[PDB]
Amino acid sequence: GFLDGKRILLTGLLSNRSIAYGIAKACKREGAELAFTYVGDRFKDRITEFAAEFGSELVFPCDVADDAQIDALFASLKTHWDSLDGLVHSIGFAPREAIAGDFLDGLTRENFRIAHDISAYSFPALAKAALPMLSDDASLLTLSYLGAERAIPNYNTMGLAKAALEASVRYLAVSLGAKGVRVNAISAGPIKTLAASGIKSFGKILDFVESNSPLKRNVTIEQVGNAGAFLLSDLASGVTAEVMHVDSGFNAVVGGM
Amino acid sequence: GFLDGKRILLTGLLSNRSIAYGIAKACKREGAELAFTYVGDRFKDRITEFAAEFGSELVFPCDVADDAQIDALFASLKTHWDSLDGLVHSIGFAPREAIAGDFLDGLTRENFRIAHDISAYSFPALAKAALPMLSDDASLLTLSYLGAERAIPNYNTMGLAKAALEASVRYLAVSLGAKGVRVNAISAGPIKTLAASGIKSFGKILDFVESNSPLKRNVTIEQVGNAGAFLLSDLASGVTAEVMHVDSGFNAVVGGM
Amino acid sequence: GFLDGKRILLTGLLSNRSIAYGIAKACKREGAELAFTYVGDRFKDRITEFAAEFGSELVFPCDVADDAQIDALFASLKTHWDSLDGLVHSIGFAPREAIAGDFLDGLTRENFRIAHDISAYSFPALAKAALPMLSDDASLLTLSYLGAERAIPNYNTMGLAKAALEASVRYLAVSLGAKGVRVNAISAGPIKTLAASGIKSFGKILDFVESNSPLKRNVTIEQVGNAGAFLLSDLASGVTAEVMHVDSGFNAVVGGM
Amino acid sequence: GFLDGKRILLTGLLSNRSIAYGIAKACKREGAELAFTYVGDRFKDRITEFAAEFGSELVFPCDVADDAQIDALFASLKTHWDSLDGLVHSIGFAPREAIAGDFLDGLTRENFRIAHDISAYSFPALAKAALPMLSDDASLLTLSYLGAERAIPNYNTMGLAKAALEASVRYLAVSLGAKGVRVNAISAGPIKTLAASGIKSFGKILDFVESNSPLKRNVTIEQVGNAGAFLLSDLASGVTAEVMHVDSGFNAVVGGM
Ligand SMILES: NC(=O)c1ccc[n+]([C@@H]2O[C@H](COP(=O)([O-])OP(=O)(O)OC[C@H]3O[C@@H](n4cnc5c(N)ncnc54)[C@H](O)[C@@H]3O)[C@@H](O)[C@H]2O)c1
Ligand SMILES: NC(=O)c1ccc[n+]([C@@H]2O[C@H](COP(=O)([O-])OP(=O)(O)OC[C@H]3O[C@@H](n4cnc5c(N)ncnc54)[C@H](O)[C@@H]3O)[C@@H](O)[C@H]2O)c1
Ligand SMILES: NC(=O)c1ccc[n+]([C@@H]2O[C@H](COP(=O)([O-])OP(=O)(O)OC[C@H]3O[C@@H](n4cnc5c(N)ncnc54)[C@H](O)[C@@H]3O)[C@@H](O)[C@H]2O)c1
Ligand SMILES: NC(=O)c1ccc[n+]([C@@H]2O[C@H](COP(=O)([O-])OP(=O)(O)OC[C@H]3O[C@@H](n4cnc5c(N)ncnc54)[C@H](O)[C@@H]3O)[C@@H](O)[C@H]2O)c1
Ligand SMILES: CCc1cc(O)c(Oc2ccc([N+](=O)[O-])cc2Cl)cc1F
Ligand SMILES: CCc1cc(O)c(Oc2ccc([N+](=O)[O-])cc2Cl)cc1F
Ligand SMILES: CCc1cc(O)c(Oc2ccc([N+](=O)[O-])cc2Cl)cc1F
Ligand SMILES: CCc1cc(O)c(Oc2ccc([N+](=O)[O-])cc2Cl)cc1F
């Protein structure tokens, strides 16, 4: 495949419906060797199962809230891999209040801090900790959503955080690009993942993009996965600082009228 | 003037070159009554002078790092004003490291947190604390910069924070808009303010927009001020969730070639 | 007013609901002297009435399909006015087929040509013919719509034409900016004008932005007019190459979900 | 490869440095069968050579200025191919005057008409003529440039035309998407093609993106080609109405300062 020999670390694989799952499958299919992170010892066995699914026994703890775990993640990976060619950042969190109902009602200094810490800061944080072992053609990929660009109901503080995340893509691209490293995001359409249970009225968004997107269909983790594999590969050698929509074209319309 | 009888609170007036100074002058010129905030008792007298300059004796402490000062700000203002028609958010900060040289070198969890806390969170925080006394036609205005949209050298972590700030404009507009309140930003071009001493190679950016902007000239606080007064006024009744460039058109070109 | 002594030529005033009507009223209110164009002798008397409404007896024929009328327009104006400070381009047309139903069904080389000729070319064409008599602080303004940025049902070929029009704003700004002349567009929300009778399901768009815009209300020609007056004035001295949304913030949301 | 069995028609292959050449190579490499168009009998033999290079004897005349040639193109192709899976639109033209020096100096009704006719109209025109034989998973791809989004020196009227072209991508995506067909553009960085000899100071743009792009290098037709192959493939099943930058990230920075 077009990722033959590429070694890629994936965060955020929580279930078989996770976006990271779809990316993992496409990457493995195209020849990559994979490693995975998880959060909390309670989940080690589940991720080891998932990892086995993709021919991997490389799983490491990483709570991105903790500097020590971020550094220890790459120290551990480094015992197995001399170089890292790909990093998939598929991680996000905000307190339920901060993504329910009215934007201001859920706004507190702490809710803001946590959302931005986990959902935005963590991406350039992992990039920085990974840097010493990044191959010169490495590719860093994060996941965003249209709520970064336009106000979407309930998304609220996550929208602010995703806006900072997309900006981080641009600044990381400049910082790491001289070396040859690329940094991109996929702005994915809604997909029924575990995280989607967080978003109130996820169902309504889903119906709405099915009915209004140019392709008149929702995207799948297979589609987001294949797009991700492309960006992580040398096929996308000329692409950096890009936020690529993989959402059936929904971002490009005004729907519902 | 077109702000006759409007009552407007301005943050961020640090000197006579501050963007807030220019906005204040244009607002006063157009008939507004003004109030001002300041940071630290060491600065109370300077701001009282500035305020006197605009026919005001209404100055209040507000360090946006402190929830208690934010709430006390509007409690105090409320003893003088029954309603608030305008709020100017002209406040920003990042640790010098986070805006010098390479993006990653200056990246730390704490530098990130502080930049976003002060430069982004503070805007919807003030909006929320002001809400009870906002008139139905009130207008909230913040200041951003092109580094939010595109990577600019040295701007670094401030770029991430300004990206979150512009997103906050959109979500605030939805939250406060039913009531009739508008929320906008001006993305201003470079202006030799005290804050600009922070940015390394501010001089180079300045020369570059003078030479490459369509108007072949840098903007002034008078120009940004007049634009701000417009947005704060009923003239801009149909305008919300907008990031308006007041930068001699520089954002719209690719210059230097 | 803030347009005291400015002399401004307005195209596209077809009725008292025209966007140009609202702009004219705001400009006159702020002190401008106005002149108007019309299309076809059949309409001379109606426009003279409208013009009288704003204290003007300056009306001139200009079908923008005809080079000769464009040049004769400014030759005639020049007999009355030594200089021109403002130009309002509020003109658009596509064959009904090209804006009904499916984009491709209405697509023909000729429909395309006409839409772009009238709706896009005409703006920089008038700018070029006006140039010799433009004051150094003159301001050129055109009207666009969100269909330029995102696909909207039925808008079709007009969307392509408005995209070219907004690009023309940027290139005109660079061409005319050295001299000091500014060039901008207002992307207006839907307004029940005569032109709106063209757009099938204008009613549905109208309801939809009322229900989904942050301000939960449609814009008025008074609002678009005041925004236009601002851009045409020295208040907007720092603003060029800008497409300003005056649409109750609708562009900034994803609505209907 | 990931285009196994896909049948793809490419326009605009003029030389071995053409962007279409690079796309053709990547498509053939990934398993596609190709067909080609050319302009003028004088060029039939050159394109037959090029086509032989990619294992093809399918070459057809198509001057996009001529409706009859557009329809005859697909009638002819249809004698060889039952279905069409991919279309590459890599065609552009403006009179030299319209892309030299000042935007207005080169502006004439005819120069405008020709640029938009050839560079924009031709894309949805080919899509419409191809429609009856398009497979349900077909993918249409056109080539654009950053001058569509921001004013670039000399690009002038081509910038207006490319703006209309990118809009056409969005409207075509909605029109053809119900069927399942995708429509996208690649906004490519500068590449020393025959067409680039048109652009005055192409050399300066080239140096400038090498020095300022995040990757600090210019893109190649190999890079644009691989990106194109991806978009034309089922790998990009979730991607439509997208303008993908393949320009070393240059669009995402403000350079030169
Ligand atoms: N699901 C969607 O519709 C969607 C759409 C667009 C964009 N995005 C984004 O895709 C990414 C992946 O989410 P998903 O949809 O696959 O849901 P998911 O629940 O399957 O994955 C989310 C991941 O976030 C991780 N996470 C949360 N806090 C963490 C922490 N402190 N440290 C490390 N990891 C942490 C979880 O472990 C989980 O694996 C997210 O960034 C999300 O915002 C998702
Ligand atoms: N100066 C520029 O070129 C420029 C350009 C574009 C955008 N912007 C922005 O304009 C706004 C105003 O900055 P300026 O250029 O007028 O410089 P300035 O130094 O005159 O104003 C900055 C203000 O930030 C305030 N501030 C910092 N920390 C604070 C805190 N914890 N609590 C309350 N206030 C605090 C300062 O008191 C000061 O008044 C900023 O948001 C800046 O990012 C500035
Ligand atoms: N009405 C809306 O909702 C709306 C919304 C957004 C943007 N825009 C735009 O605002 C502008 C004004 O339209 P309107 O809404 O006020 O409708 P309108 O019918 O009142 O004005 C349209 C004008 O186009 C003029 N026109 C058409 N062909 C012409 C030609 N060959 N030469 C000279 N003039 C010609 C007409 O004379 C008319 O005055 C248009 O550009 C329209 O696209 C309109
Ligand atoms: N070369 C670049 O740097 C560059 C950069 C960004 C975007 N784009 C675009 O890429 C596309 C391809 O151009 P290129 O760079 O490969 O140069 P090119 O000269 O190799 O290809 C241009 C093609 O335009 C075709 N063409 C012109 N008029 C035609 C007509 N009437 N009918 C049919 N075909 C016609 C030519 O035959 C030629 O094959 C163009 O659309 C160009 O605008 C090019
Ligand atoms: C609306 C589509 C959508 C967008 C997303 O960013 C998304 O991911 C998350 C959403 C919320 C949280 N949280 O609050 O903990 C975490 C994540 Cl990872 C899921 C989605 F369904
Ligand atoms: C480059 C133009 C420019 C943009 C700005 O946002 C700006 O404002 C600040 C910049 C840095 C800090 N700080 O680090 O504390 C604070 C502020 Cl308020 C000044 C500028 F000169
Ligand atoms: C949908 C909102 C909207 C957008 C517009 O541009 C608009 O103006 C026109 C629309 C169509 C034609 N025509 O085909 O002749 C002309 C004009 Cl001037 C009206 C609108 F109601
Ligand atoms: C500046 C980079 C660049 C952009 C392009 O669109 C490009 O293609 C063309 C440019 C001009 C013409 N013409 O006038 O005939 C035709 C084409 Cl196909 C070439 C480029 F070098």
Side-chain angles (χ1 to χ4, degrees):
Chain A
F2 57 79
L3 282 170
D4 282 339
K6 291 289 194 163
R7 295 189 297 206
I8 304 177
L9 173 65
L10 290 95
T11 68
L13 199 165
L14 193 53
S15 77
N16 42 74
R17 298 181 62 80
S18 284
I19 285 173
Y21 187 92
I23 295 169
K25 186 165 186 73
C27 291
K28 181 59 178 176
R29 183 178 53 70
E30 291 298 335
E33 297 169 28
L34 311 182
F36 304 81
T37 62
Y38 66 90
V39 189
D41 69 333
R42 302 272 165 148
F43 194 86
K44 186 198 202 69
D45 287 338
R46 284 290 260 125
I47 192 63
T48 297
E49 299 164 6
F50 290 123
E53 202 148 339
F54 302 106
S56 170
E57 310 190 324
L58 300 177
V59 304
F60 314 88
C62 190
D63 182 345
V64 292
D66 185 324
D67 290 348
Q69 295 193 30
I70 292 175
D71 300 329
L73 165 60
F74 297 98
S76 298
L77 188 60
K78 180 74 198 186
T79 68
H80 303 273
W81 287 353
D82 184 58
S83 293
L84 183 60
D85 305 304
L87 170 72
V88 176
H89 176 263
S90 187
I91 288 173
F93 178 73
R96 209 58 50 97
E97 317 89 83
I99 45 177
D102 177 76
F103 173 62
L104 290 181
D105 290 336
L107 185 73
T108 68
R109 191 166 289 154
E110 180 76 349
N111 287 347
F112 177 99
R113 179 194 68 78
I114 294 163
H116 287 75
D117 188 49
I118 304 300
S119 302
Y121 170 69
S122 67
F123 182 47
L126 296 166
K128 179 168 183 181
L131 183 47
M133 74 184 287
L134 286 181
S135 64
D136 284 0
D137 295 327
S139 180
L140 314 196
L141 175 64
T142 184
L143 277 295
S144 189
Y145 178 59
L146 181 63
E149 302 181 41
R150 298 201 290 272
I152 295 178
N154 298 311
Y155 206 62
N156 298 345
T157 298
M158 194 63 153
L160 279 57
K162 291 294 192 188
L165 179 72
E166 299 187 3
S168 84
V169 163
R170 297 187 284 275
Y171 285 91
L172 281 166
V174 170
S175 179
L176 301 172
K179 175 173 217 164
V181 176
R182 298 174 301 100
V183 183
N184 294 292
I186 283 164
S187 181
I191 296 174
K192 181 57 175 176
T193 62
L194 289 180
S197 76
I199 305 299
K200 283 183 181 179
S201 300
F202 174 75
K204 273 177 165 294
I205 299 185
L206 214 49
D207 298 340
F208 189 91
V209 349
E210 173 164 32
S211 305
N212 295 276
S213 64
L215 285 167
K216 260 68 189 180
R217 69 198 190 194
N218 276 298
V219 293
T220 62
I221 68 176
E222 292 81 36
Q223 293 168 347
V224 176
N226 281 330
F230 160 72
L231 288 177
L232 292 157
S233 81
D234 293 342
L235 294 174
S237 182
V239 186
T240 194
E242 182 79 350
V243 174
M244 178 186 150
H245 300 101
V246 188
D247 63 351
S248 299
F250 177 73
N251 71 97
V253 307
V254 185
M257 307 173 163
Chain B
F2 57 79
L3 282 170
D4 282 339
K6 291 289 194 163
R7 295 189 297 206
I8 304 177
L9 173 65
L10 290 95
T11 68
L13 199 165
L14 193 53
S15 77
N16 42 74
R17 298 181 62 80
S18 284
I19 285 173
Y21 187 92
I23 295 169
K25 186 165 186 73
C27 291
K28 181 59 178 176
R29 183 178 53 70
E30 291 298 335
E33 297 169 28
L34 311 182
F36 304 81
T37 62
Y38 66 90
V39 189
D41 69 333
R42 302 272 165 148
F43 194 86
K44 186 198 202 69
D45 287 338
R46 284 290 260 125
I47 192 63
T48 297
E49 299 164 6
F50 290 123
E53 202 148 339
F54 302 106
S56 170
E57 310 190 324
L58 300 177
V59 304
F60 314 88
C62 190
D63 182 345
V64 292
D66 185 324
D67 290 348
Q69 295 193 30
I70 292 175
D71 300 329
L73 165 60
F74 297 98
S76 298
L77 188 60
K78 180 74 198 186
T79 68
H80 303 273
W81 287 353
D82 184 58
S83 293
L84 183 60
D85 305 304
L87 170 72
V88 176
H89 176 263
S90 187
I91 288 173
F93 178 73
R96 209 58 50 97
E97 317 89 83
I99 45 177
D102 177 76
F103 173 62
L104 290 181
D105 290 336
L107 185 73
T108 68
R109 191 166 289 154
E110 180 76 349
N111 287 347
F112 177 99
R113 179 194 68 78
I114 294 163
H116 287 75
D117 188 49
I118 304 300
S119 302
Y121 170 69
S122 67
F123 182 47
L126 296 166
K128 179 168 183 181
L131 183 47
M133 74 184 287
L134 286 181
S135 64
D136 284 0
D137 295 327
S139 180
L140 314 196
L141 175 64
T142 184
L143 277 295
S144 189
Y145 178 59
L146 181 63
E149 302 181 41
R150 298 201 290 272
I152 295 178
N154 298 311
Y155 206 62
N156 298 345
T157 298
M158 194 63 153
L160 279 57
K162 291 294 192 188
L165 179 72
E166 299 187 3
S168 84
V169 163
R170 297 187 284 275
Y171 285 91
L172 281 166
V174 170
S175 179
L176 301 172
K179 175 173 217 164
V181 176
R182 298 174 301 100
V183 183
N184 294 292
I186 283 164
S187 181
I191 296 174
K192 181 57 175 176
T193 62
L194 289 180
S197 76
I199 305 299
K200 283 183 181 179
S201 300
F202 174 75
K204 273 177 165 294
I205 299 185
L206 214 49
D207 298 340
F208 189 91
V209 349
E210 173 164 32
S211 305
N212 295 276
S213 64
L215 285 167
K216 260 68 189 180
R217 69 198 190 194
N218 276 298
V219 293
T220 62
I221 68 176
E222 292 81 36
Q223 293 168 347
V224 176
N226 281 330
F230 160 72
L231 288 177
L232 292 157
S233 81
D234 293 342
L235 294 174
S237 182
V239 186
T240 194
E242 182 79 350
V243 174
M244 178 186 150
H245 300 101
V246 188
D247 63 351
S248 299
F250 177 73
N251 71 97
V253 307
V254 185
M257 307 173 163
Chain C
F2 57 79
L3 282 170
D4 282 339
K6 291 289 194 163
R7 295 189 297 206
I8 304 177
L9 173 65
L10 290 95
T11 68
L13 199 165
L14 193 53
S15 77
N16 42 74
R17 298 181 62 80
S18 284
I19 285 173
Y21 187 92
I23 295 169
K25 186 165 186 73
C27 291
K28 181 59 178 176
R29 183 178 53 70
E30 291 298 335
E33 297 169 28
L34 311 182
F36 304 81
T37 62
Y38 66 90
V39 189
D41 69 333
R42 302 272 165 148
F43 194 86
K44 186 198 202 69
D45 287 338
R46 284 290 260 125
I47 192 63
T48 297
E49 299 164 6
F50 290 123
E53 202 148 339
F54 302 106
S56 170
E57 310 190 324
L58 300 177
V59 304
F60 314 88
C62 190
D63 182 345
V64 292
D66 185 324
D67 290 348
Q69 295 193 30
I70 292 175
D71 300 329
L73 165 60
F74 297 98
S76 298
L77 188 60
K78 180 74 198 186
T79 68
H80 303 273
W81 287 353
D82 184 58
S83 293
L84 183 60
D85 305 304
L87 170 72
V88 176
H89 176 263
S90 187
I91 288 173
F93 178 73
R96 209 58 50 97
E97 317 89 83
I99 45 177
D102 177 76
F103 173 62
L104 290 181
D105 290 336
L107 185 73
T108 68
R109 191 166 289 154
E110 180 76 349
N111 287 347
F112 177 99
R113 179 194 68 78
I114 294 163
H116 287 75
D117 188 49
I118 304 300
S119 302
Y121 170 69
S122 67
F123 182 47
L126 296 166
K128 179 168 183 181
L131 183 47
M133 74 184 287
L134 286 181
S135 64
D136 284 0
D137 295 327
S139 180
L140 314 196
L141 175 64
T142 184
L143 277 295
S144 189
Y145 178 59
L146 181 63
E149 302 181 41
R150 298 201 290 272
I152 295 178
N154 298 311
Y155 206 62
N156 298 345
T157 298
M158 194 63 153
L160 279 57
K162 291 294 192 188
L165 179 72
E166 299 187 3
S168 84
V169 163
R170 297 187 284 275
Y171 285 91
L172 281 166
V174 170
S175 179
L176 301 172
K179 175 173 217 164
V181 176
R182 298 174 301 100
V183 183
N184 294 292
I186 283 164
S187 181
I191 296 174
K192 181 57 175 176
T193 62
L194 289 180
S197 76
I199 305 299
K200 283 183 181 179
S201 300
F202 174 75
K204 273 177 165 294
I205 299 185
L206 214 49
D207 298 340
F208 189 91
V209 349
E210 173 164 32
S211 305
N212 295 276
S213 64
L215 285 167
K216 260 68 189 180
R217 69 198 190 194
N218 276 298
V219 293
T220 62
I221 68 176
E222 292 81 36
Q223 293 168 347
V224 176
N226 281 330
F230 160 72
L231 288 177
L232 292 157
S233 81
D234 293 342
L235 294 174
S237 182
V239 186
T240 194
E242 182 79 350
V243 174
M244 178 186 150
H245 300 101
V246 188
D247 63 351
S248 299
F250 177 73
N251 71 97
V253 307
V254 185
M257 307 173 163
Chain D
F2 57 79
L3 282 170
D4 282 339
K6 291 289 194 163
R7 295 189 297 206
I8 304 177
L9 173 65
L10 290 95
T11 68
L13 199 165
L14 193 53
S15 77
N16 42 74
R17 298 181 62 80
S18 284
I19 285 173
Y21 187 92
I23 295 169
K25 186 165 186 73
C27 291
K28 181 59 178 176
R29 183 178 53 70
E30 291 298 335
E33 297 169 28
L34 311 182
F36 304 81
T37 62
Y38 66 90
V39 189
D41 69 333
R42 302 272 165 148
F43 194 86
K44 186 198 202 69
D45 287 338
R46 284 290 260 125
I47 192 63
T48 297
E49 299 164 6
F50 290 123
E53 202 148 339
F54 302 106
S56 170
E57 310 190 324
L58 300 177
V59 304
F60 314 88
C62 190
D63 182 345
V64 292
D66 185 324
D67 290 348
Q69 295 193 30
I70 292 175
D71 300 329
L73 165 60
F74 297 98
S76 298
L77 188 60
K78 180 74 198 186
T79 68
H80 303 273
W81 287 353
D82 184 58
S83 293
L84 183 60
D85 305 304
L87 170 72
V88 176
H89 176 263
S90 187
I91 288 173
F93 178 73
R96 209 58 50 97
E97 317 89 83
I99 45 177
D102 177 76
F103 173 62
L104 290 181
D105 290 336
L107 185 73
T108 68
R109 191 166 289 154
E110 180 76 349
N111 287 347
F112 177 99
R113 179 194 68 78
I114 294 163
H116 287 75
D117 188 49
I118 304 300
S119 302
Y121 170 69
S122 67
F123 182 47
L126 296 166
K128 179 168 183 181
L131 183 47
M133 74 184 287
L134 286 181
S135 64
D136 284 0
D137 295 327
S139 180
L140 314 196
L141 175 64
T142 184
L143 277 295
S144 189
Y145 178 59
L146 181 63
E149 302 181 41
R150 298 201 290 272
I152 295 178
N154 298 311
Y155 206 62
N156 298 345
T157 298
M158 194 63 153
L160 279 57
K162 291 294 192 188
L165 179 72
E166 299 187 3
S168 84
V169 163
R170 297 187 284 275
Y171 285 91
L172 281 166
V174 170
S175 179
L176 301 172
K179 175 173 217 164
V181 176
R182 298 174 301 100
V183 183
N184 294 292
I186 283 164
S187 181
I191 296 174
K192 181 57 175 176
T193 62
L194 289 180
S197 76
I199 305 299
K200 283 183 181 179
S201 300
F202 174 75
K204 273 177 165 294
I205 299 185
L206 214 49
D207 298 340
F208 189 91
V209 349
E210 173 164 32
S211 305
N212 295 276
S213 64
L215 285 167
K216 260 68 189 180
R217 69 198 190 194
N218 276 298
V219 293
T220 62
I221 68 176
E222 292 81 36
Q223 293 168 347
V224 176
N226 281 330
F230 160 72
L231 288 177
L232 292 157
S233 81
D234 293 342
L235 294 174
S237 182
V239 186
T240 194
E242 182 79 350
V243 174
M244 178 186 150
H245 300 101
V246 188
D247 63 351
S248 299
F250 177 73
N251 71 97
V253 307
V254 185
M257 307 173 163

